[PDB]
């Protein structure tokens, strides 16, 4: 018996692949229709590979590996969609909402992020021999930006598209049932193991389900679930909530763009994008804040920032358009900045989590990897470094991270965009360095949190900082 | 008796009929969805002095409305007592605050905010109402952006707020307790023959000798299908309003209502306290010629930007619980439709725009008195539902007002632009609005709120209004 | 004279041209069109100039750069067309001032506008 814990894109994708390739075994998938804190239903979603490229990512070994996997994942999507739509009919709707992406460069951000990241995207496309061209901004269809927020350069990426995350989830559920999978709409409370082997899963209704294989894909809750097992509290890297806000808008005239429209990734892994939808709706996203506790609701600030960027940088017509829904989901944000994919020291215990911005995009590849491992294979080459049971990765020097966190902090100003006296940005640059350098030194002699998490720690309570100093120390004692 | 509509007005008249006429069967129509419903989107402020504008208190019709609002205030303490009496502790409190603080900041037009602050101060003095101008440093809770902060503040005693949701629950409960029957369907058609008085949307027919229409923004469209009444009952449009429920960062809230005076096109900024670490913020206002059930991006951003800068920066990091949308019933001549009709047994209670909820106890008592052969409340005769369009202001006053309010949308943003531009816009707005007013009718001028909506509507919708205004002139002159 | 933005750049060429003319030559070919003694040139249609003056007026906003509600630029675009069209029609049946001069005339005194109507009329009588 196989139990998949979690009903997001990752859980359902691995569920579909297990059910399809092992018709002998019973595969049961846990999780409720509410999908509380669920990243997948809040996603547009972009099949982000080249669009996700930053200069900072492609300057670390670990970042170049992640990029390579995203490129590999892209190649699986056409046949993966075909195989999921094959179990349905025309009236179930299309999973694919666009084939192509246009990356826009405007001046509503930091030159140190947006200029560097546009160049890095262009470079990464050239390296991978991906079909693309720099196009005239006047040739980008549909957009009607505020002239003071308009793009002056535009990049057409061919075969980098989007899916309707809701139709994708429905198609995965349908495809899972078609292949003999059983959906049990309850949550796992506890994984039971003895003598270093999985026995099964206690559910929140009090029942016990036995299994020789348990795959944890419970998004941001995945580590908290596995860490209760002996020793594993300091052997599985913590996952926090990368709380993301997006919106569904009914456009003034029912129109939408033919392509994804996006900027490169911005301050603290935020970014602006519009994903086309059917029936006169568009998806706009997406904010990102690492929160030490989960949060199920958008802030005022997140809503205003998302709406202000979309109306000025993409289409002024969105200003008079109707707000259908504000969506909130938790990107699983791993403490060392890299996913938790594969095997555990406990036999039969697998983990598929900590995918942050691009779990959905990588889902077909990550599912195939874990199934290969479960069948005694080696799966996909580059995914070994992202073993779920590991010492915290140090992908960057403390120096690189301190430069990055100050740059991203300054970027929150330029992205607003602020208006202030010209002396003030220079003052803030110099006065931000000291406090972040002091925090990094106080937290650990060995581990440095990535920028996204460091800013969250900087503005957390003293108790939460002290708890992190203890965590980092306990992890050092376990591994060094 | 059939009451058509399940807003504050319908339920308030329903409760008062059921309580004072135990002999008769009173049935109230309307669904739990409350589509386009103003009441559930309301904070709501018991607005009397807070609603005072210089423009309102310069017309005879405006000074009457104000007087009624002052009268309505006196009924609220016993009205709440009598509604809470039919429930228990666990149903929650209707009243959320006793007092209001009016704030004056510079995030708006001097021609509205300075004039309206002075008019509020004056109206409080005239009515001998308890109030004082207080130091801004003594206003509790507020944490504005210094560049958006108030420099003057006005404490109004006994001007407070209710939870509109607990009020609706208490009205429904009190209606059932007094023998009322709730039928959760919508009226499709009022049936009358030989000048005497409902077909429901499920196909059924309900007989009655009394029909009270309190269907908010749908009230006139429902009565206008009857013979002649299309040009005898003033049109009601949708004053679409956006508000929000926010869970505050620390669970705190202010002890008083916090508000500005009314702003461009009857918009305004206010925070109404709620129980359980929530606050209400509102409220936008746009007259729409067709109904709209969803907030625009612009409305949401404007409401949130004003609240975070002018009231409390802590709201910026606070969680958005809900964006609310309701339709203020916006009468074409700017005044309510309350009382009797030329059809026997047909009553109307609508077109209350910003303050139907506040006036509900008084308006309910008025219509019940009229239904029992009484005269009700003195000042409400001018607001007969069957009337020629009122002309409360000269065309000249309205053209000055619409240009001033248009400019105010800029100062309220607040915009930053070259100093020559506001002077250019002032002069280039006058011609087009003067041309529209002249084209629409020789006799009727729409109030500013509706004139801007007509200005930016389609040519077909403008032409239809020219026909309507002409047909109303032929009916009455 | 009348070199506006680029007399300084063109000075060596313009000097050589006038000296050639003074010495009985033809100077530089393309400069005959710009004889000082002439009827007012009409290099653009009234339509082109009215589009240009509204566009340039809006540009003064974006160049500031302003920050204002997104409805406002669309309102100003439509409400600027009428007044500039009215001014152009009132000034002359034949001549249209270029955009740079039209905005100056738009925001001048009524007396100065009337004086320009007389000037344009007197020029028409001299050359038609
Ligand atoms: C605002 C936003 C925008 C995004 N945009 C994109 C995008 O453009 N492109 C892209 O590729 N991806 C996007 N993502 C998603 C990103 O790729 C995520 O990393 C990915 O969705 C993670 O998938 P998951 O299945 O691990 O997590 P989730 O979607 O969180 O799924 C986990 C599920 O398990 C359930 N669960 C929790 N606890 C238990 C339990 N104990 N037992 C059982 N079930 C449990 C949860 O309720 C949830 O439904 C976006 C996410 C957000 C929030
Ligand atoms: C954003 C906002 C803020 C406000 N703030 C305040 C405030 O601070 N103070 C204040 O005093 N008031 C406030 N109001 C409300 C104002 O006073 C309104 O004038 C008042 O609520 C109108 O009440 P009503 O019963 O006439 O209409 P509604 O509250 O709209 O009730 C009418 C009901 O009739 C129903 N209906 C429609 N068609 C039919 C049909 N055919 N059959 C049956 N039922 C039907 C509708 O669904 C609706 O539920 C606010 C309103 C809004 C939108
Ligand atoms: C801010 C600015 C920036 C410019 N930048 C450039 C540029 O980058 N490139 C470029 O090519 N050009 C530039 N120009 C100038 C442009 O090329 C002009 O067309 C050119 O300078 C005109 O030269 P002029 O000799 O006709 O006039 P002027 O330079 O005005 O000289 C005329 C002179 O005659 C004098 N005068 C007036 N009345 C009498 C009289 N009765 N008797 C005697 N003398 C009299 C005046 O006092 C003056 O000194 C710029 C001009 C300005 C104002
Ligand atoms: N407080 C009311 C107000 O400002 N009225 C505006 C006013 O009439 C004109 O603009 C100014 N500034 O004078 C006008 C120019 O189109 O737009 C108005 N506003 C609108 N109309 C839109 C539709 O109802 C649908 N979606 C929205 O978001 C609404 N916003
Ligand atoms: N793109 C992420 C980001 O900007 N992070 C911030 C960042 O760490 C600091 O701000 C800058 N500008 O550097 C910091 C100073 O307090 O506030 C951050 N913003 C937040 N944290 C709030 C909580 O999650 C709950 N409610 C919100 O609305 C969130 N907004």
Residue numbers in the entry:
A (entry chain C): 12 to 491
B (entry chain D): 13 to 209, 212 to 491
C (entry chain B): 364 to 491
Question: Anything the authors wrote about it?
Answer:
The side chains of E312 and E434 likely experience significant conformational changes upon substrate binding. Mutant E312A confirmed the necessity of changes in recognizing substrates, whereby the binding affinity versus ST-F dropped 10-fold, in addition to losing the reactivity to form 8 (Fig. 2d (ix); Supplementary Table 3). E312 another key residue collaborates with F316 to facilitate the decarboxylative reaction by introducing a repulsive electrostatic force. The fact is that the residue experiences a substrate-induced conformational change bringing the terminal carboxylate group in a short distance (3.3 Å) to the carboxylate group of the oximinoacetate moiety evidenced by mutational experiments whereby compound 6 becomes the major product in the presence of E312A (Fig. 2a (v)). As a result, E312 undergoes a substrate-induced conformational change, in which upon addition the induced decarboxylation should facilitate β-elimination. E312 not only recognizes the streptolidine base but also ushers the β-lysine to crawl into the binding site in a compact manner. In this context, E312A is able to catalyze the formation of 5 and 6 but no more 8, as opposed to F316A, which catalyzes the formation of 8, the dominant product (Fig. 2a (v), d (ix, x)).
